[PDB]
């Protein structure tokens, strides 16, 4: 949401930074935590329940004086939110080497067609073999939309323009794809409302014909009070075990999702805040709440870095210490940046300034602009990529700039800008190599001295940018965050 | 926007580098004054070697007198 967390985060800061904390401060700070929940479309009775749940969870009346009050008061509300969002039932996860079939249900316009592509692309990126099934025969041009999205996501799909019965086409698609031993088979179902009994029974017919391993209900975040009535009715007929929340960018912020969880006792697997297929984020329970309290996930980021799994770390270190920074290494670093995933999630997980800093309006196309860097650098040959310094060689023969511009677009100014960026990065790497022993390997210098670390910190603080270093936390804050990444 | 993208890149690069390269790093200990205290202690040691030397009676084994 990136907005409720700020309000809730400011409520916890109001409770803290006070010469004293009595029974009046708690209530005062609890009012700010209630108003924020009310703005999140949550029922007033549930809010009055969380307020009473945290009141009994932290009694200052007979609280053993001498124990951290704030620490156990901020943790009392963190457990409340987590509980408020955790159903308590373990989710379903497909097994390797077995055909797992997932059936999607939801209302019209919920985004099931896009959800199929998002889930399929996520599993394909993770390494799963997946295929698409289009069992929509009521929405006009639904198969065309699914086909174009699938060929955009290079994911196999099945369907037919002329077939009108969704049961037969879905069953035959599953039967066809089970022959070639496909692991994940997701079937796209047309929109449906509980008021219409014909499609209501068609849903049971397709469910019995396919027998999905798990049923996923797609719920938009912009709907209001009408969510519970349809969700309970849908669960009463089919075995819904998980749900996916879409349109997180909406103003309604999915306030009915908490009541849906309290009703169905099922968790949300993923959330999507963008129309684009690549916008797909997990809904891990503990990290989501930890983000709301300025306690960003550290395990998730290190897990992502481990997924990056750099092949070697010794030859790179000795290259850096000698002050060599080539173009091919820069291209590999950019490739790792692209493979790192969405850019917003990288800095969202840090305990730093906040998660509502990466705006979708401009940085989404800024990533595509950065994509042009590899296009420009792909015109470089092996001699240029492996050269010790590209600026020196590029300053001797201008015709190589023309050759590079041949493969790429104009690039007359773009090549010069890329060379300036490479020169700045090369000087940064030269200084990092001149720090004289801040890297692993070689000698057994496991512990780093404070003097060399101070010199490196001074060098780092002088070249990043203004207005972001001051809010980072200063030298002490930056070093503490780096230590957090070390231990975490 | 370019500055913001540069900031993001720098932060990600730093995180990656620390995770895959730097070793144990002290949080903060009022970073040592040793950078200039080296010359300060050089002057201090020049003072230390300038410690006063106590006077002494010079030995001289003379012979005999005369009669
Ligand atoms: N804002 C936003 N819109 C979304 C998202 N996912 C899907 N949509 C919208 O949902 C529409 C597609 O819905 P559709 O798949 O046809 O729903 P269906 O007819 O029930 O299958 C698209 O026009 C998107 O604009 C999202 O994450 N955010």
From Swiss-Prot, chain A:
Q: Tell me its EC number(s), please.
A: 3.6.5.4
The source's domain of life comes to Eukaryota
What does the record give under GO molecular function?
Answer: 7S RNA binding; ATP hydrolysis activity; endoplasmic reticulum signal peptide binding; GDP binding; GTP binding; GTPase activity; ribonucleoprotein complex binding
Principal subcellular localisation of the protein:
nucleus
Q: Which SUPFAM superfamilies match?
A: Domain of the SRP/SRP receptor G-proteins, P-loop containing nucleoside triphosphate hydrolases, Signal peptide-binding domain
Q: Where is GTP bound in this sequence?
A: 106-113, 188-192, 246-249
Q: Which UniProt keywords apply?
A: Cytoplasm, Endoplasmic reticulum, GTP-binding, Hydrolase, Nucleotide-binding, Nucleus, Ribonucleoprotein, RNA-binding, Signal recognition particle
- Which Gene Ontology BP terms does the record give? exocrine pancreas development; granulocyte differentiation; neutrophil chemotaxis; protein targeting to ER; SRP-dependent cotranslational protein targeting to membrane, signal sequence recognition; SRP-dependent cotranslational protein targeting to membrane, translocation
What SMART domains has UniProt attached to this entry?
AAA, SRP54, SRP54_N
Q: Which GO terms describe its cellular component?
A: cytosol; endoplasmic reticulum; nuclear speck; nucleus; signal recognition particle, endoplasmic reticulum targeting
What subcellular locations does the record give?
Nucleus speckle; Cytoplasm; Endoplasmic reticulum
Q: Where is this region: NG-domain?
A: 1-293
Q: What is known of its domains?
A: The NG domain, also named G domain, is a special guanosine triphosphatase (GTPase) domain, which binds GTP and forms a guanosine 5'-triphosphate (GTP)-dependent complex with a homologous NG domain in the SRP receptor subunit SRPRA. The two NG domains undergo cooperative rearrangements upon their assembly, which culminate in the reciprocal activation of the GTPase activity of one another. SRP receptor compaction upon binding with cargo-loaded SRP and GTPase rearrangement drive SRP-mediated cotranslational protein translocation into the ER. The M domain binds the 7SL RNA in presence of SRP19 and binds the signal sequence of presecretory proteins.
What family does this chain come from, according to its entry?
A: Belongs to the GTP-binding SRP family. SRP54 subfamily.
| Name by which UniProt lists this protein | Signal recognition particle subunit SRP54
Instruction: Tell me which species this is from.
Output: Canis lupus familiaris
Identify the gene encoding this protein: SRP54
From Swiss-Prot, chain B:
Q: Tell me where it resides.
A: Vacuole membrane
Q: TM segments?
A: 7-22
Q: Coiled-coil stretches, from where to where?
A: none
Q: According to the record, which residues are glycosylated?
A: 40, 56
Instruction: State the family named in the UniProt similarity comment for this chain.
Output: Belongs to the peptidase S9B family.
The protein's name in its UniProt record: Dipeptidyl aminopeptidase B
């Amino acid at each position: 949401l990136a907005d409720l967390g700020r309000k809730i985060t400011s409520a916890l800061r109001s409770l803290s930074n006070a010469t004293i904390i009595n029974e009046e401060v708690l209530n005062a700070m609890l009012k700010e935590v209630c108003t924020a929940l009310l703005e999140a479309d949550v029922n007033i009775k549930l809010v009055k329940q969380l307020r009473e749940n945290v009141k009994s969870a932290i009694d200052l009346e007979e609280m053993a004086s001498g124990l951290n009050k704030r620490k156990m008061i901020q943790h009392a509300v963190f457990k409340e939110l987590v509980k408020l969002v955790d159903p308590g039932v373990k989710a379903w996860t497909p097994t390797k080497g077995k055909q797992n079939v997932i059936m999607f249900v939801g209302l019209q316009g919920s985004g099931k067609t896009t959800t199929c592509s998002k889930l399929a692309y996520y599993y394909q990126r993770k390494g799963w073999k997946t295929c698409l099934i289009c069992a929509d025969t009521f929405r006009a041009g639904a198969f065309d939309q699914l086909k174009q999205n699938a060929t955009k996501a290079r994911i196999p799909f099945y369907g037919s323009y002329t077939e009108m019965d969704p049961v037969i086409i879905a069953s035959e698609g599953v039967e066809k794809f089970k022959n070639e031993n496909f692991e994940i088979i997701i079937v796209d179902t047309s929109g449906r409302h509980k008021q219409e009994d014909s499609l209501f029974e068609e849903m049971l017919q397709v469910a019995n014909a396919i027998q999905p391993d798990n049923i996923v209900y797609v719920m938009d975040a912009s709907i209001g009070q009408a969510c519970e009535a349809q969700a309970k009715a849908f669960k009463d007929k089919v075995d819904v075990a998980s749900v996916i929340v879409t349109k997180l960018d909406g103003h309604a912020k999915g306030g009915g999702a908490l009541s849906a969880v309290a009703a169905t006792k099922s968790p949300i697997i993923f959330i999507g805040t963008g129309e684009h297929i690549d916008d797909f984020e997990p809904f891990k329970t503990q990290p989501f709440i930890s983000k709301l309290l300025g306690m960003g996930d550290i395990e998730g980021l290190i897990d992502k870095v481990n997924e990056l799994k750099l092949d070697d770390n010794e030859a790179l270190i000795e290259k850096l210490k000698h002050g060599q920074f080539t173009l091919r290494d820069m291209y590999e670093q950019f490739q790792n940046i692209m493979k790192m995933g969405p850019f917003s999630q990288i800095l969202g997980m840090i305990p730093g300034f906040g998660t509502d800093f990466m705006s979708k309006g401009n940085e989404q196309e800024s990533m595509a602009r950065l994509k042009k860097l590899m296009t420009i650098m792909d015109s470089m040959n092996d001699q240029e990529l492996d050269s010790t310094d590209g600026a020196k060689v590029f300053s001797k023969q201008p015709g190589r700039i023309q050759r590079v511009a041949r493969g790429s677009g104009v690039s007359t100014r773009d090549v010069q800008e890329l060379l300036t960026q490479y020169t700045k990065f090369a000087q940064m790497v030269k200084k990092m190599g001149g720090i004289k022993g801040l890297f692993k390997g070689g000698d057994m210098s496991k512990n780093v001295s404070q003097s060399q670390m101070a010199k490196l910190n001074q060098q780092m603080a002088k070249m990043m940018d203004p207005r972001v270093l001051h809010h980072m936390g200063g030298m002490a804050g930056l070093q503490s965050m780096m230590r957090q990444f070390q231990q975490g | 926007l370019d500055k913001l993208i540069r900031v993001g890149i720098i932060l990600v690069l730093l995180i990656w580098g620390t995770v895959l390269l730097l070793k144990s790093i002290p949080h903060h200990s009022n970073t040592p004054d040793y950078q200039e205290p080296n010359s300060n202690y050089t002057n201090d040691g020049k003072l230390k070697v300038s410690f006063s030397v106590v006077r002494n009676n010079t030995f001289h084994p003379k012979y005999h007198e005369l009669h």
